[PDB]
Ligand binder design. Structure first.
Ligand code: IRN
Ligand code: IRN
Lengths: 519, 523
């Protein structure tokens, strides 16, 4: 509590300052960016950089993790008139005022539902502003890139955001119970986003949360297992300005003392409700691990490597019945749409080795995920699809084409891929290669990999390394795609290099203090 | 005294988890071709895994290292045996290395001497069999084979034979950098149809540099370049070459420039010429030479974001603008070939006009130079000199294939040798990563050798630890390319380590990684 209050890193990002752009449709919005001014003699405008760090890097805002972040999104949600306060919330150190919400009976609360109704929500304008990086349409816009048939506009408008969401091609993860959130969008026609994984002291985890988003993590997932992951997660969500994801089966397994066999729908249901009221923005759910797909993995070089996938497979095998997450998929949807939680359909059968890439198991699950996508959309629930994994370079394009076709252009969310298995200790690098390429091919979010992958638990230095690696991978992809806003950054830093403006070069880099130190 | 400094600092002995093994030549029965081998747990019932090993005798317990004497000159006797070279009457003489045991050689007038000349003459040399054996990683030659990859129209065989190697050299599509005066060399091949090689740069105390050489090759550097500037550069380089089992490259203009006291305008042919001969006799295996930076090309760089970033290129640009004359490396190219051919030194045609930023990638100057390199290539071949081509640079991902396409066409499939490329400019201090991305991709598209990049790129001088990070980063990039190309030897390594991860054989997982000590420590 107090041990965290000091250990966490706050203050402006070295070389820059927090700036805000206000909304027009919703005049009270303040959309955050960070700004990097260069030498006056350079005679250039400051450079605007996308910033997921939150109020933590704004000295005007008092931080107190014991109280949580300001709930600056709560008012915009209540004002829509479709949510009511939950009379008696579910209940499980404890986090020390916050009302808990749920859609009114018969009301529609998801971003997808709103978008299909023709409605531009506050979150949507928020995202449109955020995605433009304060660029003005004052100069001609010439595209240099190859985006493989994507529809990235010269300039994002709130109406474009609504169009993308309504068609299922973008999502805004935004539980009505995460009032702290600074809205972001995931989708091919926007900037490539990245995810940081946290989870095994409360301070340590909040710390990694703040550290991860300080350096550019766009979402964070709390992958905690073991004792007291509910209370733990309170501390993270209340103090997070980025979307927070989870794998609900992890906690459900704990309730049944780590026995996959003893898992059931009731425990999983209770867990969902608990996490919905908590403010979790997306759930990874391995509903595509079907009974008959499991024997397809017996011949694999590395079997089933997914944690969530292994758990479901163990249940299916012990009972010899169809995956109950797959079975109750409609009932899962009826819960999530009441709070606007997004689906992240998991790859239980992802390749754990390049030998296993693009095999029958992986693709069978993938095509099943596409089917479930349409069922999710019918209930008005937003979706993204999870991908591999270990994939040699010549198979990465093929991964992307299978997803695009079989999953109806829903956003893709990958773990790497790692492009070779032979370099433990450097897996952030083997995966950065695969991550940059697949993002180029159209992947919307990249889950990070740290050097400790396959070996140990990431400390806050491994977290940073991972985040910086994936930020540069994501940006390399934006640039190759010809994203309208990518090359101003590269050109700014390159003009500084040219003129020997060493300080501007450091301040414009993903990691200014490391660059200055090495110089 | 320097010798104590050196012998104490350098890392020697078995590479953790593996042991030096040799395969004997058959065409040349005295050849001993090195690999390293990693045995896995007996309960796995698997043969040891054979790994390509450029570490040299430093990790061979059968050999007693002694830097004062240099490395075993195991190559001298095969060179001499051909009867095409003779001792130099009066060798050029420039902490000095005790170079008393080494005869210096030069081609006899009218004799064949270069690997390219022998190859075109239908001759299979000791270096050719050596590399063919090496490239096979001790795999079984009489075996059905089916390849899973996409090599974009390469000509990779299921199994490398000495004649395949000869054929590749003769058409100019592969080289073997091997100066007759580098008797310590363990021969290696560079070519699209062989394993992707990597290069580590060192240079700026002698013991500092010899350590980096040993450290670099220990972790998998296939060649090394001594990019030293300033004073003592000839004498330092003695300590490197005599103690290198890998090919050593330089950029001769760096030294030529020092002889004329930093003034690029005072360079001239006489000083360049004398530099070439000195390094030829020293045993330098390849010369990066920026002969494509032509006078009319220089104003094209004016419209660039970062202009001319090549050090060698900038030096030549300065000379040209000052004397208002065509690049003399270009004008006297013929004479340069006649010198190199007499010692079998390979050309590395430098990219003086490479893009220093993604913005300038694939522009007029870059490609104008590339087509010129392509024309110099034919002239070099006419003189019987081996050639590889140097390339970018900073290039965003979507422009990378186009680079390979232009190179293959205009430079007639000669081997390509890239520095990265870096695929974005905004991560100083992580440029080994931004460039690993480009390097793996262009390796996949057919690039033969990848010049590495460390976290210090653009910022500082790499220390011991930066050199290793760069080397490991490029080894995995080069391997990622081999795997994606469907190279017949690549999958075995990845599969072995994946079986170890699956069966929870931690020791084996550690030992089969590019960096065993790190993995064990992280675990
Ligand atoms: O599938 P398992 O349970 O192994 O791993 C879940 C974690 O891996 C991430 N992921 C992303 C794509 N595939 C998997 C997912 O977002 C979460 O961070
Ligand atoms: O062009 P300059 O003189 O800056 O750099 C030459 C170094 O950079 C390497 N290189 C490789 C491809 N392009 C450049 C070349 O092999 C040598 O190692």
């Amino acid at each position: 509590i107090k041990a965290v209050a000091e250990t966490i890193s706050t203050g402006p990002i070295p070389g820059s300052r927090k700036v805000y752009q206000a909304g027009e449709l919703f005049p009270e919005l303040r959309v955050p960016f960070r700004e990097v001014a260069v030498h006056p003699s350079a005679n250039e405008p400051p450079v605007t950089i996308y910033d997921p760090s939150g109020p933590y890097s704004d000295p005007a805002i008092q931080i107190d993790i014991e109280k949580g972040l300001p709930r600056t999104r709560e008012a915009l949600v209540v004002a829509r008139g479709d949510v009511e306060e939950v009379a008696d919330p579910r209940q499980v150190p404890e986090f020390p005022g916050r009302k808990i919400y749920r859609a009114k009976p018969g009301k529609l609360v998801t971003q997808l539902e709103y978008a299909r109704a023709g409605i531009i929500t506050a979150e949507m304008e928020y995202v449109a502003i955020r995605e433009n990086l304060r660029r003005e349409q004052d100069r001609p816009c010439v595209r240099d890139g190859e985006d493989f048939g994507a529809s990235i506009p010269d300039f994002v408008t709130p109406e474009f955001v609504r169009q993308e969401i309504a068609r299922g091609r973008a999502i805004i993860p935004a539980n009505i119970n995460h009032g702290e959130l600074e809205p972001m969008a995931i989708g091919r026609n926007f900037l490539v986003k990245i995810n940081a994984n946290i989870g095994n002291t409360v301070a340590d985890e909040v710390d990694k949360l703040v550290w991860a988003t300080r350096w550019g993590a766009d979402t964070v997932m709390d992958l905690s297992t073991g004792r007291n992951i509910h209370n733990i997660r309170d501390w993270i969500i209340r103090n997070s300005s980025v979307p927070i994801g989870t794998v609900p089966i992890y906690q459900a397994l704990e309730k049944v003392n780590g026995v996959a066999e003893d898992l059931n729908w009731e425990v999983f249901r209770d867990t969902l409700i608990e996490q919905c009221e908590q403010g979790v923005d997306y759930f990874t759910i391995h509903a595509g691990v079907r009974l008959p797909f499991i024997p397809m993995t017996a011949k694999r070089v590395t079997g089933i490597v997914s944690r969530g996938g292994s758990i479901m497979a163990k249940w299916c095998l012990a009972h010899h019945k169809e995956n109950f997450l797959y079975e109750r998929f409609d009932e899962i949807c009826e819960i999530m749409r009441a709070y606007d939680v997004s689906f992240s359909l998991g790859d239980g059968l992802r390749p754990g080795s390049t030998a296993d890439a693009n095999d029958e198991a992986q693709f069978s699950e993938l095509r099943t995920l596409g089917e479930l996508t349409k069922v999710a959309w019918k209930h008005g629930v937003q979706v993204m699809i999870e991908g591999p994994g270990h994939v040699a370079m010549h198979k990465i394009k093929a991964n992307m084409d299978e997803q695009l076709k079989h999953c109806h252009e829903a956003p893709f969310y990958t773990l790497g891929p790692l492009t070779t298995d032979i370099a433990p200790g450097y897996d952030h690098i083997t995966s950065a290669i695969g991550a940059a390429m697949i993002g180029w091919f159209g992947t919307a979010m990249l889950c990070y990999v740290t050097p400790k992958e396959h070996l140990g638990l990431p400390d806050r230095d491994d977290v940073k390394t991972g985040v910086i690696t994936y930020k540069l991978a994501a940006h390399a992809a934006d640039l190759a795609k010809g994203h309208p806003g990518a090359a101003m950054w590269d050109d700014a830093i390159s003009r500084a290099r040219f003129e020997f403006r060493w300080e501007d070069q450091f301040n414009l880099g993903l990691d200014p203090e490391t660059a200055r130190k090495f110089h």
